[PDB]
Design a protein around this ligand. Sequence first.
Ligand SMILES: OC[C@H]1O[C@@H](O[C@H]2[C@H](O)[C@@H](O)[C@H](O)O[C@@H]2CO)[C@H](O)[C@@H](O)[C@H]1O
Ligand SMILES: OC[C@H]1O[C@@H](O[C@H]2[C@H](O)[C@@H](O)[C@H](O)O[C@@H]2CO)[C@H](O)[C@@H](O)[C@H]1O
Ligand SMILES: OC[C@H]1O[C@@H](O[C@H]2[C@H](O)[C@@H](O)[C@H](O)O[C@@H]2CO)[C@H](O)[C@@H](O)[C@H]1O
Ligand SMILES: OC[C@H]1O[C@@H](O[C@H]2[C@H](O)[C@@H](O)[C@H](O)O[C@@H]2CO)[C@H](O)[C@@H](O)[C@H]1O
Ligand SMILES: OC[C@H]1O[C@@H](O[C@H]2[C@H](O)[C@@H](O)[C@H](O)O[C@@H]2CO)[C@H](O)[C@@H](O)[C@H]1O
Lengths: 226, 103, 103, 103, 103, 103
Amino acid sequence: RLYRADSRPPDEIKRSGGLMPRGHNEYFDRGTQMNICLYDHARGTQTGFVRYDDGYVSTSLSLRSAHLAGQSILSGYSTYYIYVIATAPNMFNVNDVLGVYSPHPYEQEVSALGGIPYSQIYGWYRVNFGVIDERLHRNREYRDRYYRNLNIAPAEDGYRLACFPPDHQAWREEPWIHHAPQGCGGDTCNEETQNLSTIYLREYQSKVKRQIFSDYQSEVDIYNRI
Amino acid sequence: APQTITELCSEYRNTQIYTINDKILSYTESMAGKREMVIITFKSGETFQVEVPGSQHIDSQKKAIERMKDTLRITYLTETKIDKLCVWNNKTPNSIAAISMKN
Amino acid sequence: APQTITELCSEYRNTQIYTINDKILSYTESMAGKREMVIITFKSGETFQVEVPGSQHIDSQKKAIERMKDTLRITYLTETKIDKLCVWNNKTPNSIAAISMKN
Amino acid sequence: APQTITELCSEYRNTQIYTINDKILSYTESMAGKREMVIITFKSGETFQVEVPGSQHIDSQKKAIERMKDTLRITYLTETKIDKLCVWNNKTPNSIAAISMKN
Amino acid sequence: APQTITELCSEYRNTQIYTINDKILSYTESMAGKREMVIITFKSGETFQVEVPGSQHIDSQKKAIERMKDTLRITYLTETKIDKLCVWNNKTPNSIAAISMKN
Amino acid sequence: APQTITELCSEYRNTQIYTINDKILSYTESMAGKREMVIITFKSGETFQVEVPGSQHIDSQKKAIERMKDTLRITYLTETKIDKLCVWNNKTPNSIAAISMKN
Ligand SMILES: OC[C@H]1O[C@@H](O[C@H]2[C@H](O)[C@@H](O)[C@H](O)O[C@@H]2CO)[C@H](O)[C@@H](O)[C@H]1O
Ligand SMILES: OC[C@H]1O[C@@H](O[C@H]2[C@H](O)[C@@H](O)[C@H](O)O[C@@H]2CO)[C@H](O)[C@@H](O)[C@H]1O
Ligand SMILES: OC[C@H]1O[C@@H](O[C@H]2[C@H](O)[C@@H](O)[C@H](O)O[C@@H]2CO)[C@H](O)[C@@H](O)[C@H]1O
Ligand SMILES: OC[C@H]1O[C@@H](O[C@H]2[C@H](O)[C@@H](O)[C@H](O)O[C@@H]2CO)[C@H](O)[C@@H](O)[C@H]1O
Ligand SMILES: OC[C@H]1O[C@@H](O[C@H]2[C@H](O)[C@@H](O)[C@H](O)O[C@@H]2CO)[C@H](O)[C@@H](O)[C@H]1O
């Protein structure tokens, strides 16, 4: 389980289809084209939010760390929640992919490419005046069987999504060198990095639709219809 | 055979194409006698129906009417964006002849 | 033809509209002899049934009854909000004639 | 007319209500000749079947048996909890007569 | 029987394998008389149809044309990638004989 | 009646139990005349088919075959693990007789 402090309440998260990155309204909204970039996401900091810009939503490896970050950022909030998230291939350990070039090392963040679908959120705790309400509220739409066995995406698959700038020495070195997008280490690099990250997301989103939309599939009696 | 919904729509009289490009706002299903139909609306105000099977339908259209109702229900539930609708405009609400969606 | 569930409901005698705006609480299905039906319930305590097909049903309704039961099963399993129900109030539980969902 | 599964169950001989309140553990489906059936089990050790259609089944039940099998498969896949079962105990495993689920 | 779509495809005249390895771009469904069919297209620019049932279809294919349309609709909605298509190239758009998906 | 897939499998000749404990890797569906069938394969290398309805099939199996195909499609789409399969091994690829899933 991964944890994230967030001011956005459970029903809003439901309306959006998950914990979205900065500027993404609904999870399956291909309407606005998001800039997915790990390195850029790993460096920025937001007001009133734990890292969530550049198409990635940040998460902590523990409730305490998630609590600490919340207290520091959401210091003056009567209420805010800490979401409990299942591990799955849309998650990337920021320290492992960016390596020695990880901007905020010590923290140990694991980021979800494209946000976190509602069905991957196990539950949440409510935090009142900075104090955690130890009652874990369970999300009824969490896909237990599906997420039960999944893990964070291994670092190898994230290197080519690292999004280091083109002339950034990292592309000219192990292990990013073997995974550098076409044009990294002109704009080809940028558009290539964005194209790969969007492919990875679109494929993950399909795995999600296969889960949630199948619930609506109703079988037909072909012999009666025909 | 036709290759697009616009092309297919054009071979019938009393039809017209609506570019919806939006999900279904509401879905109504009825089993009431002589009113076994489905009605859908969009946030723009449009309302369309899948007609009760009648004499204006050839035999081959019966299984197709059932299929269309299956499609609209699941499209509504999944909140899937409808691109275009080919409808007969000599019926109120306009009657759905074809539908198209794009990803 | 009707454009909304209310308008369609008003075309029958012994009907009434129930505004639900809530997900189904319990779902009951039976394949027992002479009682092949479905019963749904809500937090409000209201209980409705999809009647066993019978003489009161014209042949066109038979397929619509099966569809209604499919729709209710899906709605229950996905906790989808039901907006309104058009029921015949001269049955116990009230019999479902049409359903509408929104958003 | 029955309003609950228990009330419905009491109308038949050799039936019993089992309060499951749990998701199905395993699902078995067979298309082998004379063994077209579904078998489900629970963690508690309980095993039930949906019988091969036979002479004990009337016309109206034929469709209902297919629906129950559809219901058990989707219920399994979605990990939905089953509240109660009304079963015929004069068969082994016990035969499902009706099913209920809630929340 | 065949073990792969390629093997199954080569057993017919006027067929060919298309390696798509892509999700369906658009889905079109028509219930219009004599044009009860589905049409799909890919980002590549290829367009395919499930033909209208006719005299070129033996009885056993009738239930299969229906299943195929159900599969294409759910494959489209879920954005599931189609691997290969076996199509009859003596039709415009090429007509779908078989489909395969992986992963 | 049988209580497990193993017991059920044992009642037939030319059958064999396969323990899969894995999701379906590929799904192939065909509507081609005389080949209206589904073929599935697993990572391990096994390939199985739901066979084309024929003379070796009793009437009760016609519906059962359609159900099995519905099951294989939905279990493929949802990536649900198949526990065991009971297959007729006197066919190539081996023919599916029963399937079980457990979580
Ligand atoms: O088929 C549904 C559609 O029917 C139209 O009626 C056609 C009819 O199908 C055709 O066979 C006959 O020649 O008369 C009409 C020609 O336009 C209805 O007009 C339309 O509203 C739908 O109901
Ligand atoms: O249709 C279900 C409904 O039937 C009513 O009886 C009607 C029915 O509407 C009609 O199709 C039939 O031919 O004539 C009957 C005339 O009264 C019931 O009153 C109602 O409760 C439902 O059961
Ligand atoms: O319908 C399934 C149910 O049937 C019982 O048999 C009944 C039969 O339905 C009826 O036609 C006859 O008049 O009475 C029989 C004895 O109750 C089975 O006994 C039961 O186990 C189920 O299979
Ligand atoms: O089965 C759909 C398929 O039919 C082809 O026609 C075949 C037909 O299957 C067969 O019964 C007939 O005797 O011979 C034809 C080829 O020799 C169509 O040509 C093809 O495009 C599909 O429509
Ligand atoms: O039922 C599918 C199954 O059929 C076997 O064939 C049998 C049939 O099941 C039974 O009614 C009887 O014994 O006649 C046939 C003679 O072999 C197949 O052998 C098996 O592979 C499946 O096809």
